[PDB]
């Protein structure tokens, strides 16, 4: 084995699995998903004695069931339900990489409302809703509302988080530290406008979000991480095992 030496020993046999996923979305004003997909990777961190033969099992039939469009593995994976079998490197390594497009959980729904007021004002109401278990918290949420180029100033009201009008970036950035599943939040903004060439209307860019959630948007669930070392005297159940899911936004846009 070229990726794992042979005399490794640990008194505390332990492994940590990380399911890191980026969820991407393009949503129309009318609520139709124009496009969506998840890119994920499973990173393993293992401190296991010997030369352990592990078995990684997730919800892959294709309750819980998820379809994987494609995927790639780490050389230690012995290709041929049908699950993954390997003798892992020590420390941290990427066990697998995959893509999903079906039955994706969109953690956030963005509902924008724009009203034009003569030529001097723009009235914007943006509502965000968390689509996930209430016991789970999202963190690092940011909602970004683009403002026209002829913006003389912006007034915003948001009961949750903090918001800042950023003239340089031509946008209103609303930041929220945490937000539990199944909740709603809104921001209101009055965009004061300057005079401009009338003919050239404004091509309204999408409202976009940034967030981090503790579950895999693709629906992936680790079922087991079986450890077997034929020689040494530690069995599967002696191993201390942890899993962590960190699903984050990629391009997550809502057309207004």
């Amino acid at each position: 084995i070229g990726w794992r030496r042979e005399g490794i020993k640990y008194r505390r046999n332990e492994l940590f699995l990380d399911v890191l996923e980026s969820v991407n979305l393009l949503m129309s004003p009318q609520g139709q998903v124009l496009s969506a997909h998840v890119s994920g990777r499973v990173v393993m961190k293992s401190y296991l004695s010997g030369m352990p033969e592990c078995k990684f099992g997730m919800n892959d039939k294709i309750k819980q069931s998820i379809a994987i469009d494609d995927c790639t593995f780490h050389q230690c994976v012995r290709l041929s339900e049908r699950s993954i079998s390997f003798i892992p490197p020590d420390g941290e390594f990427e066990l697998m990489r995959y893509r999903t497009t079906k039955d994706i959980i969109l953690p956030f729904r963005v509902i924008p409302l724009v009203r034009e007021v003569g030529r001097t004002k723009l009235e914007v109401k943006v509502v965000i809703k968390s689509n996930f278990k209430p016991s789970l918290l999202a963190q690092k949420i940011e909602v970004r509302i683009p403002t026209p180029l002829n913006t003389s100033g912006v007034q915003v009201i948001c009961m949750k988080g903090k918001a800042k009008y950023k003239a340089s970036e031509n946008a209103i950035v609303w930041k929220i530290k945490r937000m539990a599943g199944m909740k709603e939040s809104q921001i209101s903004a009055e965009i004061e406008l300057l005079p401009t060439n009338d003919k050239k209307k404004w091509a309204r860019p999408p409202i976009s979000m940034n967030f981090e959630v503790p579950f895999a948007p693709s629906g992936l669930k680790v079922r087991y991480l079986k450890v077997f070392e034929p020689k040494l005297n530690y069995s599967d159940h002696d191993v201390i095992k942890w899993v962590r899911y960190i699903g984050r936004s990629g391009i997550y846009e809502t057309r207004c």
Binding site: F16, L17, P214, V222, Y224, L225, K241, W242, V243, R244
Partner: peptide, 6 residues
């Protein structure tokens, strides 16, 4: 956060 895997 990390969760135990049975």
């Amino acid at each position: 956060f990390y969760r135990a895997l049975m």
